[PDB]
Symmetry: C3
C-alpha cells in the first residue's frame, strides 16, 4: 500500500480524514439548526418548510457557519502542510504530536464554538492548533528553499 | 507520465480539474452579477462603477456567494479525499463511479442553486454528491488506521 | 529528499507555503482589527472584551473577512493545481513563472484589498494571478483526458 510511502503518512491520513468528517458533522448540524429554528437562506427552501417568512437569518445558524468558515480557514491549510510535511522525513513521534495537537485543538475548537463556551476557551484552542501548522510551514519553507 | 501512478488517477484529475473550473465559473458569474445589478462589496469599487450608493448587498450576489461557499465546503474536501483514495488501489470502475457521481452532483448543485430551482432539488444534489465523499473517507480511515 | 521528485516541485512548495503564511497573516490582522475596533462576532467574546455592545459588525473586520474569503476562493485551488502541475514535467522556468505570477499577484491582492487601494488595482491583481491557474488547469485537463 502507498499509505506506507513515509512513516508519518498513516497518522497524517487518519487525523486529516477525521477532521474532514468533523467538518461534515458541522454541515449536518447546520442543516438541523436551519430546520429546527426554521431559518433558511433561500426563498425556495422557506416555501417548502412553512412559508416565505422563514427565509431569515438566525444567530445559531450564523454561529454554525462561523465554525464551518473557521474550519475552512485552518483545516484546509493543514491538509496541504501535513501532507507535504509527512514526506520530509520527520521524526515519527514528533510528527504524531504535530497531527494530534491539531486534531485535538480543532475538535475542541468546534465544541467551544458550537457549545458557546466562555472566552477565551475557543481562542486558546484555535491558537494551540495553529502552533503545529506554523511549525510545519517553517520546516517546508527551509526544505523547499534549500532545494531551489 | 506520473498521471499513471495509479489506474484511478487520470479520472480523479479530470473530474477535479473540471470542478475547479466550475468554481472559477461561479467566481466570474458573481462578478457579472455585481456589475449588472450594480452591487459592490467595497466603496472603492462602487465609486468607479457609478457612485457610493452602489456599495450595497444584493440577493443574487448573495446567492452566488452561497453557491461558491458551498463549493468550498464540499469540493475542497473531495480534492483531498479523491487524491488519497486514488492511491488505495480501488476498483477502476468503482472509483470512476465515485468521481462521476461527485462531478454530476456538484454541477447539478450549482445549476439548482443559481437557477433557483424548487426545493428539494438542490438539497438532493448536495446529498447525492456527498455519498461518494463519505465512502472515500471511510475507506481512507480503515487504510490509515490499519497502517498505524 | 522527496522535494526533488520533480524539478518544479521546490518552487511550488516555496510559493505555496508563503501563500499559506500570507493567509495566516490575514487571520492575525483580522483578530487585531476585532480587538482594536472592539467588534466581535460572538457574545462570549464581547463580554470578555468590554461588554455585550461590542458584539457587532465593523466595516474593517468585514473587509478582512472578504480578503480571507477571496484567498480561500483562489489559493486553495492553486495548492491543488500547482501540485499536480509540478508532476506533469513542465519547463522549469515556465513553471517558476506560473508560481511567481500567482505569488506576486496574490500578495498584491491582499495589499490592495486591506490597503483600500483605488479600483481597479485589486481587480487587476486578481485577474493577473488567475491567469497561471487557468493555464495549469487546462494543462492538467489535457494530460488527464489523454490518459483515460
Ligand atoms: C456533509 C455530509 C456528509 C456525508 C453525507 C451527507 C448527506 C447529507 C448532507 N446534508 C447536509 C445538511 C442538509 C440539511 O439538513 N438541509 C436542510 C436545511 C435546509 C433544507 C433542508 C434539506 C432537507 C432535505 C434534504 C435532502 C433531501 C430532501 C430534503 C427535503 O426537503 O425533503 C441536507 C444534506 N450532508 C452530508
Ligand atoms: C475565476 C477566474 C479564472 C480564470 C481567469 C479569471 C479572470 C478574471 C476573473 N475575475 C473574476 C470576476 C471579476 C469581476 O467581474 N469583477 C467585477 C465586479 C466588481 C469589480 C469588477 C471588476 C472589473 C475589472 C476587472 C479586471 C480589470 C479591470 C476592471 C475594471 O474595473 O475596469 C473580475 C476578475 N476571474 C478569473
Ligand atoms: C493564523 C495563525 C498562525 C499561526 C499561529 C497563530 C496563533 C494565534 C492566532 N490567532 C488568530 C487571531 C486571534 C485573535 O487575535 N483573536 C482576538 C479577536 C477576538 C478574540 C481575541 C482573542 C484573544 C486571545 C487569544 C488567545 C488567547 C487568549 C486570548 C484572550 O482573550 O486573552 C487569536 C488567535 N493565529 C495564528
Ligand atoms: C464536531 C461537532 C461538535 C458539536 C459540539 C456541540 C456542543 C453542544 O453543547 C451544547 O451547547 C449549547 C449551546 O449551543 C448549550 O446550551 C449546552 O449546555 C451544551 O451541551
Ligand atoms: C456552472 C455554472 C452553472 C450556471 C447555471 C445558471 C442557471 C441559470 O438558470 C436561470 O436561472 C434564473 C434564475 O436565477 C431563471 O430565471 C432562468 O429561468 C434560468 O434559465
Ligand atoms: C499580507 C498582509 C498585507 C497587509 C497589507 C496592509 C496594507 C495597509 O495599508 C494601509 O491601509 C490603510 C487603509 O486600510 C491606509 O489608511 C494606509 O494609508 C495604508 O498604509
Ligand atoms: N476569520 C477569523 C480570523 C481570526 C481567527 O481565526 N480567530 C479565532 C480565534 S479568536 C476564531 O475562533 N475566530 C472565530 C471565527 O472565525 O468566527 C475571525 O473572524 O475571527
Ligand atoms: N453551510 C451549509 C451547510 C449544509 C449544506 O451544505 N446544505 C446544503 C443542502 S440544503 C446546501 O445546499 N446549502 C446551501 C448553502 O450552503 O448555502 C448551509 O448553510 O446550508
Ligand atoms: N467572491 C468574489 C467573486 C469574484 C472575485 O473574486 N472578484 C475579485 C476581483 S473584483 C475580488 O477581489 N473580489 C472581492 C471579494 O471577493 O471580496 C466576489 O464576490 O467578488
Ligand atoms: C507561532 C510560533 C510557532 C513556531 C513553531 C516552531 O517551529 C520550529 O521552527 C524551527 C526554526 O525554524 C525549526 O527548526 C523546527 O523544525 C520547527 O518545529
Ligand atoms: C452517508 C452514508 C454513506 C456510506 C458510504 C459507504 O461506504 C462504504 O463503507 C464500507 C464500510 O465502511 C466500505 O467497506 C466501503 O468500501 C465503502 O464504499
Ligand atoms: C483565462 C485565459 C488564460 C489561458 C491560459 C493559457 O494556457 C495555455 O493553454 C494552451 C492551450 O490549451 C496550452 O497548450 C498551454 O500549455 C497553456 O499554458
Amino acid at each position: 500500500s502507498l499509505v506506507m510511502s513515509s512513516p508519518a503518512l498513516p497518522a497524517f491520513l487518519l487525523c486529516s480524514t477525521l477532521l474532514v468528517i468533523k467538518m461534515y458533522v458541522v454541515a449536518i448540524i447546520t442543516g438541523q439548526v436551519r430546520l429546527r429554528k426554521k431559518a433558511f437562506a433561500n426563498p425556495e427552501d422557506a416555501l417548502r418548510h412553512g412559508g416565505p417568512q422563514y427565509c431569515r437569518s438566525d444567530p445559531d445558524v450564523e454561529r454554525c457557519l462561523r465554525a464551518h468558515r473557521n474550519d475552512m480557514e485552518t483545516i484546509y491549510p493543514f491538509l496541504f502542510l501535513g501532507f507535504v510535511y509527512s514526506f520530509l522525513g520527520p521524526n515519527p513521534f514528533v510528527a504524531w504530536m504535530h497531527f494530534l495537537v491539531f486534531l485535538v485543538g480543532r475538535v475542541a475548537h468546534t465544541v467551544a464554538y458550537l457549545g458557546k463556551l466562555r472566552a477565551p476557551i475557543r481562542s486558546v484552542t484555535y491558537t494551540l492548533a495553529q502552533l503545529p501548522c506554523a511549525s510545519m510551514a517553517l520546516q517546508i519553507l527551509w526544505e523547499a528553499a534549500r532545494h531551489l
